[PDB]
């Protein structure tokens, strides 16, 4: 939920009340009675909690940030799942033994360099959540360095389909591709369904890019296509404008018609939101509020 | 309600308010050692306006059996308790 | 640890802040949430 780990290190090892040992500029801010909200609040403390603050502010203490700088590292390693969460009580029990064994002027200044690049040079972790080359760009640029670029029929639409497929894994942060076994896959979401067999799809689409099929043929592709190729073309449909594969290829009978099939449900869901909200507006059997509703929409 | 009482603080304004707010500020600090909470007449009002009735409701009313029936080991009462439009029964009583 | 130089009257929390205050907010949030089952409030020195 947080952005930075060192703020949680500054939340688990700093005093919540204002002390002059660490925040002098706020502890002296209220001794001299110069504060906007509640100014006159330090005279009326007795000699117990005046001298226990007014001595320690005009000459500060000299504490040791060794126990605090390591929590800005041990947290920064468990935020990125390098360590198990069940385990950080051991490594801080081992790093604090480490940097007190080999302590110097250098290591106290070398940890302090390392609690800055886990703050402002950990912006790469903010970066490839957006560009998602975790598993979407550099894991697919091996796939595009695997397919043959010499297709006999349809030389131009072959390199515009994968030009529209690299855009698919780029405009979606959740989708990713990977190497499992001798073939590459592609899931549209983490914790997600609809895994396409990406090797067994472009091998099915090879020798298929030029057909120029007529518009009176529907039930032939049970022995020609494969339903995951029929689902990969479903996942390429919203990111494919009308200028990719124009009109008369058999993919124009597929990719354009898949956008119309998505174009049905992206307005009939708004119809389905109306019907399920008027069954309780007039009084309708909720068991029979979905049987006849779906049959009108399928 | 009748300012021979509101001056007397029999009823009306309560002890946190007709005291001067410096003095309410005083004794909330001082209860551990010097308590003047015994001296200042906090009133209560026990309000009217739809708490107690007017229109001849009986408070407790004894119900009755109709058709008790007997076996040599048991006894089976058979009541018709009823309450109408008002007098919402607690049933723990 | 390090002999962190302090007065005796605040390094022993006789005249100091409270378990609400000198502790870390990550521990006061822990000490307030676990107050039902795993009490650890008596260990952290309320002074008067």
């Amino acid at each position: 939920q947080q952005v930075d780990p060192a703020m949680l290190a500054a939340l688990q090892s700093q005093p919540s009340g204002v002390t002059p040992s660490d925040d002098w500029a706020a502890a002296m801010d209220r001794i001299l009675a110069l504060t906007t909200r509640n100014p006159e609040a330090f005279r009326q403390q007795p000699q117990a909690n005046r001298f226990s603050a007014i001595l320690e502010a005009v000459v500060p203490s000299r504490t040791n940030p060794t126990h605090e700088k390591v929590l800005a590292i041990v947290n920064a390693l468990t935020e990125s799942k390098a360590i198990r969460k069940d385990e950080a009580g051991l490594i801080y029990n081992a790093l604090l033994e480490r940097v007190a064994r080999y302590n110097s002027t250098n290591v106290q200044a070398n940890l302090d360099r390392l609690t800055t690049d886990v703050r402002e040079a950990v912006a790469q972790r903010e970066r490839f959540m957006h560009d998602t080359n975790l598993g979407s760009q550099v894991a697919l640029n091996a796939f595009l360095s695997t397919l043959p670029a010499n297709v006999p029929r349809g030389q131009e639409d072959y390199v515009s389909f994968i030009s529209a497929l690299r855009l698919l894994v780029a405009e979606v942060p959740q989708s990713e591709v990977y190497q499992s076994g001798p073939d590459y896959f592609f899931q549209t979401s983490r914790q997600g369904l609809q895994t396409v067999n990406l090797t067994q799809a472009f091998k099915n689409l090879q020798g298929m890019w030029g057909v120029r099929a007529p518009v009176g043929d529907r039930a032939t592709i049970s022995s020609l296509l494969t339903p995951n190729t029929r689902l990969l073309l479903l996942l390429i449909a919203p990111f494919t404008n009308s200028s990719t594969i124009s009109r008369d290829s058999y993919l124009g009978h597929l990719i354009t018609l898949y956008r119309e099939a998505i174009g049905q449900t992206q307005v009939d869901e708004q119809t389905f939101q109306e019907i399920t909200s008027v069954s309780r507006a007039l009084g309708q059997q909720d068991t029979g509020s979905l049987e006849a509703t779906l049959n009108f929409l399928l | 309600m009748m300012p021979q009482w509101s001056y007397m603080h029999i009823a009306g304004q309560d002890a946190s308010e007709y005291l001067s707010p410096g003095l309410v500020q005083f004794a909330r600090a001082t209860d551990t050692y010097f308590s003047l909470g015994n001296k200042f007449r906090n009133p209560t009002v026990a309000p009217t306006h739809d708490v107690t009735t007017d229109r001849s409701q009986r408070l407790t009313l004894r119900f009755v059996p109709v058709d008790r029936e007997d076996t040599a080991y048991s006894y089976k009462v058979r009541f018709t308790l009823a309450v109408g439009d008002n007098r919402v029964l607690d049933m723990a009583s | 640890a390090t002999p962190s130089m302090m007065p005796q009257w605040s390094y022993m929390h006789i005249a100091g802040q409270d378990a609400s205050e000198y502790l870390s907010p990550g521990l006061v949030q822990f000490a307030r949430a676990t107050d039902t089952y795993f009490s650890l409030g008596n260990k952290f020195r309320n002074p008067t």
């Binding site: - | 004794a27 050692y33 308590s35 200042f40 906090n42 | 802040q17």
Partner: peptide, 29 residues
């Protein structure tokens, strides 16, 4: 504020509840 009179539990003064300013002890009240 009158904070220099209350026996402070720590830095916060011990300021009592709001029923600690009056009383309503009558026979049946």
């Amino acid at each position: 504020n009158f904070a220099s009179l209350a026996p402070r539990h720590g830095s916060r003064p011990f300021m009592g509840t709001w029923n600690e300013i009056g009383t309503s002890q009558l026979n049946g009240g």
